[PDB]
Amino acid sequence: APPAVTISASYPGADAKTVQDTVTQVIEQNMNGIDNLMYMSSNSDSTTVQITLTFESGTDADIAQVQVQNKLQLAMPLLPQEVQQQGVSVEKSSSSFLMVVGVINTDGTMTQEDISDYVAANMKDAISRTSGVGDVQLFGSQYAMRIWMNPNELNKFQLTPVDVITAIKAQNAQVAAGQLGGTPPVKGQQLNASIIAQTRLTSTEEFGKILLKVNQDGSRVLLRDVAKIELGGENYDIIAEFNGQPASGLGIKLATGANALDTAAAIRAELAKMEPFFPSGLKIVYPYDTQGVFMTMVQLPAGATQERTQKVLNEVTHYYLTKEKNNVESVFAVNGFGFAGRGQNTGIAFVSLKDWADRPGEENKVEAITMRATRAFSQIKDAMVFAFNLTGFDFELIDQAGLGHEKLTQARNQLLAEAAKHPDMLTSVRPNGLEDTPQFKIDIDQEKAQALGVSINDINTTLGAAWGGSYVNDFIDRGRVKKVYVMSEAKYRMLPDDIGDWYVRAADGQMVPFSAFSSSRWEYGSPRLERYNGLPSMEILGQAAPGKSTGEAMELMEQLASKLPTGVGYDWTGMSY
Amino acid sequence: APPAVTISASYPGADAKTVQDTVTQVIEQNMNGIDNLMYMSSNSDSTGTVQITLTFESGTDADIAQVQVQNKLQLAMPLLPQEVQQQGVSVEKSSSSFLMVVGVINTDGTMTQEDISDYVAANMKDAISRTSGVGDVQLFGSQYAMRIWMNPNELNKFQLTPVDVITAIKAQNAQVAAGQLGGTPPVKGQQLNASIIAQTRLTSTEEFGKILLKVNQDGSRVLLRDVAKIELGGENYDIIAEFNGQPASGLGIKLATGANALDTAAAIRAELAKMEPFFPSGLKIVYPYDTQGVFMTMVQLPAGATQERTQKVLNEVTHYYLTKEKNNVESVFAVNGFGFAGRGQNTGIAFVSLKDWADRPGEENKVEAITMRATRAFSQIKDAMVFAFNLATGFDFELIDQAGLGHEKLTQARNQLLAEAAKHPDMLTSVRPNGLEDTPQFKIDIDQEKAQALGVSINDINTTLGAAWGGSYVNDFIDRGRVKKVYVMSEAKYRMLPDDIGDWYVRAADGQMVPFSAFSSSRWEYGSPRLERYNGLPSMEILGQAAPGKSTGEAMELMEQLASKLPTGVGYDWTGMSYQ
Amino acid sequence: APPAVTISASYPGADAKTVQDTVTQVIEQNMNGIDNLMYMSSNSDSTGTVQITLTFESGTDADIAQVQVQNKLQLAMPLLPQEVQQQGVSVEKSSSSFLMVVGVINTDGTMTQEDISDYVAANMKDAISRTSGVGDVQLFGSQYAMRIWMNPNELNKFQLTPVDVITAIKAQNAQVAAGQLGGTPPVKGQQLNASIIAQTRLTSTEEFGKILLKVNQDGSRVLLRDVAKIELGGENYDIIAEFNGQPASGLGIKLATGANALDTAAAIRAELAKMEPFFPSGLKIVYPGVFMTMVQLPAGATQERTQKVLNEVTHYYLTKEKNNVESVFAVNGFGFAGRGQNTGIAFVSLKDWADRPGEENKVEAITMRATRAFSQIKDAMVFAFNLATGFDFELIDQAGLGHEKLTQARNQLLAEAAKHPDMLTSVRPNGLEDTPQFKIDIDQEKAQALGVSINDINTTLGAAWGGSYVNDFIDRGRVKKVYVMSEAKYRMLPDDIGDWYVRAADGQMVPFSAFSSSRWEYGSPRLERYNGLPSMEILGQAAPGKSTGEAMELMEQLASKLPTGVGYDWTGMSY
Amino acid sequence: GSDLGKKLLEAARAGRDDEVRILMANGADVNAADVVGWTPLHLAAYWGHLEIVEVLLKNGADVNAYDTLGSTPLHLAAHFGHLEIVEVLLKNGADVNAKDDNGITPLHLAANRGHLEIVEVLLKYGADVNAQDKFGKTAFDISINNGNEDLAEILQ
Ligand SMILES: CCNc1cc2oc3c/c(=[NH+]\CC)c(C)cc-3c(-c3ccccc3C(=O)OCC)c2cc1C
């Protein structure tokens, strides 16, 4: 292969464009003076950023990573504060999984939510430090302290999310307080002792009794009086299942250049060290090990919910657990994660067959099963459901003259239209990315905000803390460091009319609803902005028509492209380079 | 030569001393435990720039040296001013000289220099910088920024400061993460799922125009355009190129240590070929320097010299090649504000390309004779040190301050050494300092007591002063799809003369505007615009040539003798050619 | 050996749990994606310090390891606190020990160890680290820092807090960019082009003394002088170094992989002979063949107490072994398995093997004697020794039990190892024990009722009692730090807490006593972790006539009997 | 949102004129909304598909459809610069002074993006020039805040 280093970063609550223009563009503009870089591609979602730098075949993957990490270190201070705190990762690894380590609870004592935190808090790190382990993907989230804010109760006592956050930073602190008898000391000093002031909080109990304010009569407004307080995931996006029951697990990619077999064993040895100390019921299951396994991918059209993707994964699981009983030992299925990317609209299912010896006949081998499966799932509505083991072409349409996303889409659509008019050379020329979707656009009226004495900082923190969530600081949960997140309780951040129930305090102490200084409309925007070598782009996949070769099909695509609007370019990547 | 790693940082609005003591020294102190390090040198300029050069043994793995240098730089990154961090500190591993220059003009004259420089910066520079073998890339010009040119009369008229301006720009050219409707965890049954789009980066001079600064009590509006001119314009205005007398920009491309010069030049022409089809009408690439066929011309005026004065010299130099050497000279690519030894207002350079070998018969028409004639002809140019040359037995002397003597005493001890070497023509010819002389600077003293009495903060004073006279990078914005900088600065006419300091106002806690002269005093003093350092201590580099026929060992041996007689504190070392 | 890389960070003023849960844990969590890692262990201690030691597979490139480890840490710097980033987190290969140690002293008694260290920092260290074959060079001290020693009585008198002093220093010891007259783009025809120079950094104690804190309403100024003693001093005072009872500093010098020790050692000795004419009055270089003496006082014991005992040790060698000993170099606040006011270690330089004839003047004979002499010291363990049969056990918290339960389990195992003295002897913790500590709770309700900010409280406490690195200054043209802290006599005992006042939103000064309550409790002054989980290192050895592997089977046996959630693992020379 | 509902909404968006004709002749609801209240006419007016806007209206589409925030297909066409479609909608009885939940009228939108030809077509068809959004603002006030003197001149 040609080695690929992958930068990954995150911005809680940001949209694709925000991500792209505050993170993606900034990293890319500084990825230079790096040896042997063939090309660079990137994604910015309405979740998160992936920049993939692909190097010349023969390149020393170590150096590529070091050089890359070093340029990212020099761009770090240009990125937003919110992004840096999440911590960017830079990884040299294959983009396929070596294996998946499933975790279930046979006694049913622990939910999906509880299991994933077990894995995050007790297993992931050790596996992550095992040699050969390039990337580790948790199928779930680690617990954070969740402060679920109520806007009705916040407005009742004239507080905002800004007040909550301020108090969480003041009362969930870890203070350096010096010592008694500390150096340099007076003559004859007999006592030396550490001073311990505030330490991090550890419980919901504790966070709940954070004191927000004293009313003028004397009563106390605590954080439990404007919020529900529970341990809950950092994100809620990824949920998994193992033969239909609640599960978490670890997708483990092999480090570029590592031994696949040795890495597998080392991972197994480290898991053997953990088992003794599991809670009653926890159990490791091994659903995908690389003639024996395959995956099944699920793409719903963008704008789809988690609930609807779960419906499709259930039919997928159901087919393997019922119609293919005698061949399938197990199905590990994940809502919210996809072979390429993340998001509420995708999903994947890892399938593990029974012993080769108990599946006699060419119709029960992996090729026949996957084919039957895909035939079976083609009868599913508004979902691309494709099951496959582990060559046509790979084309990037590039914005070469500042045209814009709206314009590059029309040029993409015009190229797709033309390619459809040659069934004899090109079949299923599809775009690899996603379509624009209804997004809620809200304008802050700066005049009214000023007239009323309402800070824009207090407005956008209120908007953003409530509807997107905000990582405030760290806390210790059973002795491990973890995040604290302030966000609105689900029910006050679901519908447009809820915008108007959030109040912001003015300079004169009066509460002002968002309604007063905001206005909103629907519009369309991208949920996944693509870039190829620094410029906006759109990846198009296709294959050569039957009894016609790659080169001829490519030659046609190249001709079709010359007739696109001024400033639209192209390039070949991946298999086509 | 030996491999070199170069740390480069930039601090806009900073004088040489501020640069040195706030950026250079801090970095330097961590530059140890680096394997195979021969020596380290650095300049701190009043252009607000540092350039630390770390030079290594021959056979040293350049990739490893760059990692070791950067690993140590990271120790200091958190102690550097935030203003420096944001400009992007760079660590590069290239040869000191150019491999080639890629020039860009507009044959339909429909694009100024500023335009051409913004096109190259935003559509061409990055892709080239990512090309393998490309060590360092130097834009001859500057990418656009959103320029808010403030007017201090208008700001006083509405009880505003640049601080207010900057605050309004951070609030109203924001890019906000606002979350979603129907985001996870949802209420079960939720159908709707849409991103929330709030403020987004501004994209136009018009959008900045309307940024709201205040609502007056009588209901009228004060917009940013009511207190500033607003336009695209360079991040800075220090670097101006010309190609054969026409407006130009371009890329100076240095080769990475160890890379293949021919393959790297191939890849650049490949990557330039991908760009050409999408150019605006009129634009054209040209190739004024490839690497006898070529030569450069160094142009150095004395410090304090303006851009205009350097432009006259570059005019006279371009004139000589275009009139007097027409039959040999194919093109001239002249750059004002950038020279060999980094940057200034007082410095310049010309890349000269000759015609075909076979169109230039005669020894008086080859590179040597030409450069000799040019150099000779330019020697009569007044208030300028111009010479022309393509690309040996001199010496490289560093005069070091080793007892905290300071810059003034080290200047004194330098001159003693030069005036003594002036009395030895037999052994030493042309002993000269490689750096710049002190020039007048405007020292201003904030009276703390009066500032406290009047209720005005020092942060507000120092932001108002730096932002107006030096400029301030506020945040980013988006110009035709690309991220770019937003700079707040005074319009030129209000930051030209010393009496202009009083026209700027700061607002106190009680709402009253206080003029800059209510709480300050100023006087002229002298000071350096290029503070040098060697192996961590303040230095002054002295160059010289062995006298006709004497060896460099015997020339070096007298320099050491002379140096013995200098005051205590003042040692010396040998660098460059003279180390080995 | 197997290669090892060590991450060192520092959080000055911080206690051990603060350092663990704020730095160590966070760095640990990012040490994934690093090739060839066998195990990782770390300590977090009461002096403010973290050591994280990643140990690698035999034959691993220790330079490649240094780099992968370094880059992961760097990507995690934004996750660490400001005060820790500003100290610098070093990542260095810890495999080899010193090539040679160079002591520096003054024989006139005219120089403190702070003074000598500053001289070494500014005149010797860099020239030496540029010398042929030299890698890392570590200073035994720091360069000077400007020390502001606050007085709470003078601070309260003029209605100011440490927050005010810190703001004042940041504003008046500043050097900010102020642009130019006639800078580009200019008005065409501009003649004048001149840098604008506004405030520059301060250079001396005098200039810090003049810093204006406020102007009283009667006219009179309050200067930083008027509320603080100001002097050039050290960056920290945790360690004291004596050479034969005189103040000391020095350089620990390492050998750059590749280079040769005999040629490098003469290269250094040459380079030091060059400086030796340029030294100030009575500054001498010394060079410490060698054995050691450990010093260990009880929990809570002070620097001064440890220094009495170290001096006794130095005195015994310089009198009772004046025929055998050349020098005792004494370090107070550092030892084996220790940092703190109650530990110390004396390095004893002996004379030539020639001039110590007879078995009774050899290393072993001397150390046995010394150990007899020192066993008659009250309230001090003092072992002399010179540096096979032992093991290295890591008791590990596997289920988030916490420190108290992990200690209870360590005790269960250790009481049990006592009952098999036949197979196992000297079963003990490698670590330290819990000790008394001063817990102070801020009353959130009272602070809010009075209008006292919590950040003003926590800065006032931390700045006064733990010190605070404010910003840099320029000492004789060299960039150096500026620390604010309380003068020692107002941060010694619990009663001193009430002397410290804080200004509330309304303007009234409020004492610490009005909004805090305090008590004694116990806690770790050195918390340990092994492969990212809390841990307690246990050492031991097999008895007479027992192979080491047999003794291991018994530890494992007992260890399998411990409370649920406690596991173990073998490390070091038992891996 | 039925099956031939969704087929139409998606087809109206992508400009597949043939497919819109096909689905109309098989009884596909011309008032099929999506989760934000966009009928096909909204989608077509937003993404500038002139033929489909006529073809839907011809099959009796609601010219004055509201999305969930009060906004009509005319608003969309005015905002994004779809001149013929503005003309065509107003021809078939599009409310010229329709207000979304914020008091915003098609004129406000056309004005704010400086779509001068659309502004006149609107004024022509009866457009209350002294209309105010929730913050008191006319299409004039907008022209002043945008330095757009060609428009202020059209607004007189
Ligand atoms: C013959 C003299 N031999 C030595 C003298 C030493 O003096 C030291 C003085 C210091 N400050 C003075 C103000 C500090 C900070 C560290 C020192 C170390 C030291 C450095 C790194 C790690 C551990 C130690 C250390 O103390 O060793 C314990 C094993 C040290 C070590 C040796 C061998």
PDB file of C-alpha atoms in Angstrom, chain B residues 30-134:
ATOM      1  CA  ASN B  30      15.934  25.504  25.255  1.00  0.00           C
ATOM      2  CA  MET B  31      18.226  24.789  22.249  1.00  0.00           C
ATOM      3  CA  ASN B  32      20.552  22.224  23.947  1.00  0.00           C
ATOM      4  CA  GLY B  33      20.591  18.426  24.043  1.00  0.00           C
ATOM      5  CA  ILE B  34      20.459  18.573  20.258  1.00  0.00           C
ATOM      6  CA  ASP B  35      22.849  16.062  18.724  1.00  0.00           C
ATOM      7  CA  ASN B  36      25.534  17.099  16.169  1.00  0.00           C
ATOM      8  CA  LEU B  37      25.067  20.862  16.697  1.00  0.00           C
ATOM      9  CA  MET B  38      28.034  22.880  15.474  1.00  0.00           C
ATOM     10  CA  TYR B  39      26.604  26.307  16.255  1.00  0.00           C
ATOM     11  CA  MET B  40      23.568  28.513  16.547  1.00  0.00           C
ATOM     12  CA  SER B  41      23.023  32.107  15.411  1.00  0.00           C
ATOM     13  CA  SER B  42      20.040  34.445  15.347  1.00  0.00           C
ATOM     14  CA  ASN B  43      18.758  37.888  14.241  1.00  0.00           C
ATOM     15  CA  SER B  44      15.965  39.852  15.891  1.00  0.00           C
ATOM     16  CA  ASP B  45      14.668  42.692  13.592  1.00  0.00           C
ATOM     17  CA  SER B  46      12.523  45.821  14.093  1.00  0.00           C
ATOM     18  CA  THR B  47      10.395  44.402  11.260  1.00  0.00           C
ATOM     19  CA  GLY B  48       9.152  42.204  14.095  1.00  0.00           C
ATOM     20  CA  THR B  49      10.952  39.015  12.972  1.00  0.00           C
ATOM     21  CA  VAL B  50      13.293  36.345  14.395  1.00  0.00           C
ATOM     22  CA  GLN B  51      15.344  33.870  12.492  1.00  0.00           C
ATOM     23  CA  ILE B  52      17.282  31.341  14.553  1.00  0.00           C
ATOM     24  CA  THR B  53      19.614  29.278  12.391  1.00  0.00           C
ATOM     25  CA  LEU B  54      20.992  26.007  13.801  1.00  0.00           C
ATOM     26  CA  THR B  55      23.858  24.584  11.764  1.00  0.00           C
ATOM     27  CA  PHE B  56      24.899  20.906  12.014  1.00  0.00           C
ATOM     28  CA  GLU B  57      27.783  18.494  11.242  1.00  0.00           C
ATOM     29  CA  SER B  58      28.037  17.157   7.670  1.00  0.00           C
ATOM     30  CA  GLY B  59      26.382  13.759   7.376  1.00  0.00           C
ATOM     31  CA  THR B  60      23.787  14.733  10.039  1.00  0.00           C
ATOM     32  CA  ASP B  61      20.327  13.337   9.266  1.00  0.00           C
ATOM     33  CA  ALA B  62      18.349  16.526   8.418  1.00  0.00           C
ATOM     34  CA  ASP B  63      14.931  14.942   9.287  1.00  0.00           C
ATOM     35  CA  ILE B  64      16.267  14.030  12.821  1.00  0.00           C
ATOM     36  CA  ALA B  65      17.831  17.481  13.306  1.00  0.00           C
ATOM     37  CA  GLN B  66      14.520  19.140  12.478  1.00  0.00           C
ATOM     38  CA  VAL B  67      12.722  16.877  14.939  1.00  0.00           C
ATOM     39  CA  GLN B  68      15.284  17.555  17.702  1.00  0.00           C
ATOM     40  CA  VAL B  69      15.081  21.325  17.088  1.00  0.00           C
ATOM     41  CA  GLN B  70      11.310  21.325  17.112  1.00  0.00           C
ATOM     42  CA  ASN B  71      11.017  19.023  20.136  1.00  0.00           C
ATOM     43  CA  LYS B  72      13.043  21.715  21.973  1.00  0.00           C
ATOM     44  CA  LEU B  73      11.140  24.622  20.469  1.00  0.00           C
ATOM     45  CA  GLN B  74       7.945  23.097  21.994  1.00  0.00           C
ATOM     46  CA  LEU B  75       9.355  23.698  25.468  1.00  0.00           C
ATOM     47  CA  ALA B  76       9.136  27.472  24.766  1.00  0.00           C
ATOM     48  CA  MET B  77       5.944  27.738  22.633  1.00  0.00           C
ATOM     49  CA  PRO B  78       3.734  28.233  25.747  1.00  0.00           C
ATOM     50  CA  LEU B  79       5.976  31.088  26.985  1.00  0.00           C
ATOM     51  CA  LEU B  80       5.887  33.013  23.716  1.00  0.00           C
ATOM     52  CA  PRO B  81       3.428  35.863  23.362  1.00  0.00           C
ATOM     53  CA  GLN B  82       0.047  34.787  22.069  1.00  0.00           C
ATOM     54  CA  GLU B  83       0.518  37.250  19.176  1.00  0.00           C
ATOM     55  CA  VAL B  84       3.558  35.223  17.990  1.00  0.00           C
ATOM     56  CA  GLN B  85       1.983  31.812  18.401  1.00  0.00           C
ATOM     57  CA  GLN B  86      -0.937  32.863  16.166  1.00  0.00           C
ATOM     58  CA  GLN B  87       1.283  33.985  13.281  1.00  0.00           C
ATOM     59  CA  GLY B  88       2.548  30.412  13.130  1.00  0.00           C
ATOM     60  CA  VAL B  89       6.102  29.656  14.094  1.00  0.00           C
ATOM     61  CA  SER B  90       7.868  27.624  11.423  1.00  0.00           C
ATOM     62  CA  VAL B  91      10.694  25.065  11.478  1.00  0.00           C
ATOM     63  CA  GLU B  92      12.265  24.379   8.094  1.00  0.00           C
ATOM     64  CA  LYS B  93      15.255  22.490   6.802  1.00  0.00           C
ATOM     65  CA  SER B  94      16.454  24.053   3.581  1.00  0.00           C
ATOM     66  CA  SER B  95      19.503  25.462   1.902  1.00  0.00           C
ATOM     67  CA  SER B  96      20.009  29.166   2.521  1.00  0.00           C
ATOM     68  CA  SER B  97      19.748  30.153  -1.189  1.00  0.00           C
ATOM     69  CA  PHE B  98      17.022  29.824  -3.816  1.00  0.00           C
ATOM     70  CA  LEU B  99      16.745  26.895  -6.246  1.00  0.00           C
ATOM     71  CA  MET B 100      14.412  28.898  -8.506  1.00  0.00           C
ATOM     72  CA  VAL B 101      12.011  31.846  -8.687  1.00  0.00           C
ATOM     73  CA  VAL B 102       8.545  31.492 -10.120  1.00  0.00           C
ATOM     74  CA  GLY B 103       7.361  34.892 -11.292  1.00  0.00           C
ATOM     75  CA  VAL B 104       3.825  36.021 -12.003  1.00  0.00           C
ATOM     76  CA  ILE B 105       2.661  38.973 -14.079  1.00  0.00           C
ATOM     77  CA  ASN B 106      -0.495  40.150 -15.794  1.00  0.00           C
ATOM     78  CA  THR B 107      -0.099  40.743 -19.534  1.00  0.00           C
ATOM     79  CA  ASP B 108      -3.435  42.603 -19.700  1.00  0.00           C
ATOM     80  CA  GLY B 109      -2.317  44.990 -16.851  1.00  0.00           C
ATOM     81  CA  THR B 110      -5.822  44.450 -15.239  1.00  0.00           C
ATOM     82  CA  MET B 111      -4.345  43.342 -11.867  1.00  0.00           C
ATOM     83  CA  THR B 112      -2.110  45.393  -9.603  1.00  0.00           C
ATOM     84  CA  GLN B 113       0.788  43.938  -7.725  1.00  0.00           C
ATOM     85  CA  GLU B 114      -1.338  43.670  -4.582  1.00  0.00           C
ATOM     86  CA  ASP B 115      -3.884  41.558  -6.554  1.00  0.00           C
ATOM     87  CA  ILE B 116      -1.224  39.379  -8.181  1.00  0.00           C
ATOM     88  CA  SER B 117       0.383  38.761  -4.788  1.00  0.00           C
ATOM     89  CA  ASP B 118      -3.048  37.778  -3.359  1.00  0.00           C
ATOM     90  CA  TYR B 119      -3.710  35.409  -6.229  1.00  0.00           C
ATOM     91  CA  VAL B 120      -0.338  33.666  -5.847  1.00  0.00           C
ATOM     92  CA  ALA B 121      -0.750  33.479  -2.056  1.00  0.00           C
ATOM     93  CA  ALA B 122      -4.260  31.982  -2.040  1.00  0.00           C
ATOM     94  CA  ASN B 123      -4.321  29.802  -5.171  1.00  0.00           C
ATOM     95  CA  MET B 124      -0.661  28.791  -5.766  1.00  0.00           C
ATOM     96  CA  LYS B 125       1.652  29.074  -2.666  1.00  0.00           C
ATOM     97  CA  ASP B 126       0.322  26.224  -0.520  1.00  0.00           C
ATOM     98  CA  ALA B 127       0.292  23.527  -3.172  1.00  0.00           C
ATOM     99  CA  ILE B 128       3.897  24.442  -4.006  1.00  0.00           C
ATOM    100  CA  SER B 129       4.879  24.451  -0.301  1.00  0.00           C
ATOM    101  CA  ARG B 130       3.453  20.913   0.019  1.00  0.00           C
ATOM    102  CA  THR B 131       5.414  19.616  -2.975  1.00  0.00           C
ATOM    103  CA  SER B 132       8.169  17.255  -1.828  1.00  0.00           C
ATOM    104  CA  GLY B 133      11.724  18.639  -1.958  1.00  0.00           C
ATOM    105  CA  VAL B 134      10.470  22.144  -1.291  1.00  0.00           C
TER     106      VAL B 134
END
